[PDB]
């Protein structure tokens, strides 16, 4: 008989990493509110990763991020306008730096979100990682306000947890922002607040840093009379409580019996 329930020419069925998924989801969400997406370099120069972001040395703030320091001769690290830049190399502890590179390379108003891999010297367990992605958003322009930060995080709650989801804002400390804060979203199903990320209005000194590094390149000042807010949040967390993945270590374990389980997702 000419069966048809029989197996076919075993062609390979592609897939995607839990993070590409959860990252895209997040991107599209923000793309819809006008945010464009730009990437940054994982190997950063302490200037961007710390000094441009009002985080001085031997400063208590420096302790919030446990840095990874690099050492190598024969490595060209280009900055905003693509020029050569000097500084003590490191693996970025967050994505913020890109928030500075962008502002010198462009002029307000604008909205951007930058996703990316970030590193921290820490011990990798079930709910902690040394290598984990983040997402930064920064909106700058005349008249901008905190209300607008509060609005965009709200729009992210809805888009992510349903009309019955709500956002919460608590004052917290970050050298690159003032006022600043941490924000939590309510996840009705799980019925518990999720501390999502941090954000606030850009620090006056971060604009000064930008405009300074600006003239030093022949470019005219651009952020003298604008305002802006920025936020940053951790992917893996979401992706975890959204795809029900128990152990963060899984993302990098490169296990197939794991990555395949997401082939479908969208």
């Amino acid at each position: 008989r000419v069966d048809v329930s029989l197996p076919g020419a075993s062609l390979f069925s592609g897939g995607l990493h839990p993070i590409t998924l959860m990252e895209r989801e997040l991107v599209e969400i923000f793309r819809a509110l006008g945010y464009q997406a730009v990437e940054g370099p994982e190997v950063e120069s302490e200037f961007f990763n710390f000094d441009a972001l009002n985080i001085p040395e031997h400063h208590p703030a420096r302790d919030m991020w446990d840095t990874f320091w690099l050492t190598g001769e024969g490595f060209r690290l280009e900055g905003p306008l693509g020029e050569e830049v000097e500084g003590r190399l490191l693996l970025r502890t967050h994505t913020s730096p890109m928030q500075v590179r962008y502002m010198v390379a462009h002029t307000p108003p604008f909205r951007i979100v930058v996703p990316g891999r970030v590193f921290r010297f820490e011990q990798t367990d079930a709910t902690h990682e040394a290598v984990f992605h983040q997402l930064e958003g920064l909106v700058v322009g005349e008249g901008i306000a905190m209300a607008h930060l509060k609005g965009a995080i709200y729009e992210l709650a809805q888009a992510l947890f349903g009309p019955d989801s709500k956002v919460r804002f608590q004052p917290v400390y970050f050298p690159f922002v003032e006022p600043g804060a941490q924000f939590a979203v309510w996840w009705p199903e799980g019925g518990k607040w999720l501390e999502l990320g941090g954000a606030g209005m850009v620090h006056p000194k971060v604009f000064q840093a930008v405009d300074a590094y600006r003239e030093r390149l022949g470019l005219p000042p651009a952020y003298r009379g604008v305002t802006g807010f920025a936020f940053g949040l951790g992917v893996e967390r979401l992706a975890m409580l959204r795809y029900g993945i128990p152990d963060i270590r899984y993302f990098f374990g490169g296990r197939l019996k794991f990555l395949e389980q997401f082939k479908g997702v969208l």
């Binding site: 197996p7 020419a9 479908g264």
Partner: protein, 785 residues
């Protein structure tokens, strides 16, 4: 709507130029599709007086004797060629555009023609070439060059839209501009009217199809040719001049979107009667066409005694007999507002489209009839000598337009602009409106000619277009969308991802026409189309597709004939009609297959496409099995249905041989199904750490039992700790108990919390080899490292 610049410049004296005009109109709402320079008249073309037309013995030609400064003769064979009129004499030498030849002094029938008089076609002023032009005998001094009285002209081919019928009048345009700030010059009715009765009467038997109807009485008419300016203006606008009276009605028509016919009294009888046409009534329309009216065709009729006869089809075309001509001495002038739908249907009915029908289908100034009379009468008095009856026969009394409430604050709040009040009001007043009150909300009553002005909105667009659409700033809205709008796009997205995943995997997208050929339901074997067209493009495109798959098979053929694709893997996604409109996905395979370009061993046929699909699904994360089930269009041996997530949604299989044979096509595999495909949520399965337990065996099944049944079986009972079931080898023949088959099955069991004992597997396998034999299936081998 040909818009003659020099003409429109008579109402709007301050016009800068053709180009600036096209620019100004475009802003007002009217887009010109072209501009033309039109009256190139050489110097050789002088104005002459026909002193005497003499016939030529033996011919149908006449020897004209012209006074063109000097006395010249010219041979002519034109019906209107007569004494008393003025002609367009193109002297010997003149080069004419209308005859692409040089005009000479040739010899025709014993008389030498010193040039030749011309027709609207030979001069180039118009398409008509059936007779000389006819001008007043004294238009110009004999000889003077015509150019000196007929300068070239620029004509804009304007676009008037349904909402602006008033714009069908050069003076309607001329008012829109006046609001832009220009000066308006409306012509005056110089009438010397005398009190006396009208030798006829009006009876409107159908006040529905003629809500307002007027007639005017002009007598003493001296029918002759229209003055050079009018013939020019008429010619430029697309119409051919006929004579005084006739022309004067066309001109005023064009001047003010008010069609009007002059009826010779000789045929009026006792009166004019506007009434539906009696079944079969006949009428010889002006186009010389004999027609047979219909009961719904409103008509203009005259009655003598107890006889009622059609004088012309109301607001579309007049009768060829009542038509004003040379000997007319008095007329009854029609100037009325007809009913849109009637005229509409009538015109359509007789295949007539005219300047008159056109404007009546769009609308006319409900209170314009009386003023249109004065215009026309005044002209007739000046151009034809007309004595005129100080009174009119008016049937009907329309109500003036109603006041529209207008808040300037809304004008702006809607436009996003911020024009100051006073600036708004004055715009309206310039346009004719009357504005009452002192704010906030005003009382604006449009002029009778603005049929488009009813709401406040129409009124805001009035400020908008006169200030400038360009004076409206740019902006962008900011608002939290309303809850129910949230997620509203899942569906549209869901489809794309699928089109993409498909476009990636390896399928070429196609776009087939939604239309079907009724004869295909037969060819491809399908229940006929539930929807058809009352007006298809062709018989082949007379129905609406029920299946996406036939369009695919057809492209395959259409391709194989233009280019010879050795293979193809298409797919289309579209709306299919039947009972309900549903979205369908489908694509056909075909071709040599997939293998090595220089090697023979290849992969193709059923299983190729069957594999491709299993991929597409594994990728979508959807379960997928394919059980056999015959289908008319498919092959019997190669055919089955689709099962995504345990539910049927379409079919997959090879086309039916005969359908191929009848289509002259090789074996063409394919499939079709219905979207939105099943949606399965993620149940994350934290993978076990411990090692799995490998297993092996081949089930002995009778040649018929489909692989599917065997599998489902093995699995069904293969314990709850099974990980993978997979067929690696399918054998059948010696020494097996003939007419059977063994299926090589790779198994694996794995406990999540701990490893598994041999007792747990050896005992868990006997469970599946028992229910297997309890079904009638054997066992080739078991336990093989």
């Amino acid at each position: 709507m040909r818009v003659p610049f020099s003409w429109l410049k008579a109402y709007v004296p301050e016009l800068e130029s053709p180009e600036v005009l096209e620019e100004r109109l475009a802003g007002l709402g009217f887009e010109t599709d072209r501009i033309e320079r039109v009256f190139p008249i050489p110097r050789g073309v002088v104005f002459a007086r026909v002193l005497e037309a003499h016939p030529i013995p033996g011919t149908r030609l006449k020897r004209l004797v012209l006074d063109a400064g000097r006395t010249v003769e010219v041979v002519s064979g034109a019906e209107n060629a007569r004494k008393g009129i003025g002609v367009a004499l193109a002297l010997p030498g003149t080069e004419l555009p209308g005859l692409g030849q040089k005009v000479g002094e040739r010899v025709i029938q014993g008389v030498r023609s010193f040039g030749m008089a011309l027709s609207p076609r030979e001069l180039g002023v118009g398409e008509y070439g059936g007779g000389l032009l006819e001008f007043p005998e004294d238009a110009l001094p004999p000889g003077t060059p015509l150019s000196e009285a007929w300068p070239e002209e620029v004509v804009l081919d304007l676009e008037v839209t349904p909402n602006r019928p008033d714009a069908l009048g050069l003076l309607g345009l001329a008012r829109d501009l006046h609001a832009l700030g220009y000066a308006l010059v409306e012509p005056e009715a110089a009438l010397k009217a005398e009190a006396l009765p009208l030798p006829f009467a009006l009876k409107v038997e159908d006040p529905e199809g003629a809500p307002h109807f007027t007639l005017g009485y002009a007598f003493g008419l001296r029918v002759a040719p229209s003055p050079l300016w009018m013939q020019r203006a008429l010619f430029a606008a697309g119409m051919r001049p006929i004579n005084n009276v006739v022309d004067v009605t066309n001109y005023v028509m064009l001047e003010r979107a008010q069609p009007m016919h002059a009826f010779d009294l000789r045929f009026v009888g006792e009166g004019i009667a506007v009434r539906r046409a009696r079944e079969g009534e006949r009428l010889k329309t002006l186009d010389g066409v004999e027609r047979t009216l219909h009961p719904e065709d409103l008509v203009i009729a005259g009655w003598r005694g107890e006889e009622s006869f059609p004088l012309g089809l109301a607001g579309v075309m007049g009768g060829a007999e009542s038509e004003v001509r040379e000997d007319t001495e008095a007329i009854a002038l029609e100037v009325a507002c007809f009913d849109p739908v009637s005229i509409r249907k009538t015109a359509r009915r007789h295949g007539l489209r005219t300047e008159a029908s056109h404007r009546f289908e769009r609308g006319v100034d409900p209170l314009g009839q009386v003023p249109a009379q004065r215009r026309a009468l005044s002209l007739l008095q000046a151009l034809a000598g007309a004595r005129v009856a100080e009174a009119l026969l008016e049937a009907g009394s329309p109500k003036p337009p109603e006041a529209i409430p207008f808040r300037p604050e809304y004008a702006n709040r809607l436009l996003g602009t911020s024009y100051p009040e006073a600036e708004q009001i004055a715009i309206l007043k310039r346009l004719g409106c009357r504005v009452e009150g002192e704010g906030p909300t005003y009382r604006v009553t449009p002029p009778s000619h603005r049929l488009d002005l009813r709401l406040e909105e129409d009124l805001v667009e009035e400020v908008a277009r006169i200030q400038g659409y360009e004076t409206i700033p740019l902006a962008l809205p900011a608002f939290f969308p309303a809850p129910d709008n949230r997620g509203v796009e899942a569906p549209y997205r869901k489809e794309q991802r699928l089109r993409e995943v498909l476009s990636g995997l390896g399928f070429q997208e196609v776009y087939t026409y939604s239309f079907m050929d009724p004869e295909d339901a037969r060819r491809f074997r399908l229940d006929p189309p539930r929807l058809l067209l009352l007006n298809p493009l062709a018989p082949e495109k007379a129905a609406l597709r029920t299946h996406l798959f036939p369009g695919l098979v057809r492209v395959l053929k259409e391709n194989l004939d233009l280019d010879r694709p050795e293979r193809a893997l298409l797919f289309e996604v579209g709306r299919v009609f039947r009972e309900r409109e549903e979205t369908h996905l489908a694509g056909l395979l075909f071709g040599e297959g997939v293998g090595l370009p220089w090697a023979k061993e290849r992969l193709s046929g059923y299983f190729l496409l069957k594999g491709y699909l299993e991929a597409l699904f594994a990728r979508l994360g959807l379960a997928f099995r394919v059980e056999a089930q015959a289908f008319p269009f498919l092959h019997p041996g190669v055919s089955g249905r689709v099962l995504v997530e345990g539910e049927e949604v379409g079919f997959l299989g090879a086309l039916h041989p005969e359908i191929a044979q009848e289509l002259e096509l090789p074996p063409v595999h394919l499939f079709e199904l219905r979207l939105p495909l099943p949606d399965k949520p993620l149940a994350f399965q934290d993978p076990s750490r411990h090692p799995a337990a490998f297993r092996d065996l081949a089930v002995v099944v009778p040649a018929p039992t489909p692989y599917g049944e065997v599998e489902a079986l093995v699995r069904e009972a293969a314990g709850p700790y099974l990980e993978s079931l997979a067929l690696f080898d399918l054998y059948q023949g010696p020494p097996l108990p003939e007419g059977h088959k063994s299926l090589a099955f790779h198994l694996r069991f794995r406990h999540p919390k701990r490893t598994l004992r041999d007792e747990e597997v050896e005992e868990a396998v006997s469970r599946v080899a028992e229910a297997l034999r309890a079904r009638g299936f054997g066992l080739r081998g078991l336990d093989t490292p």
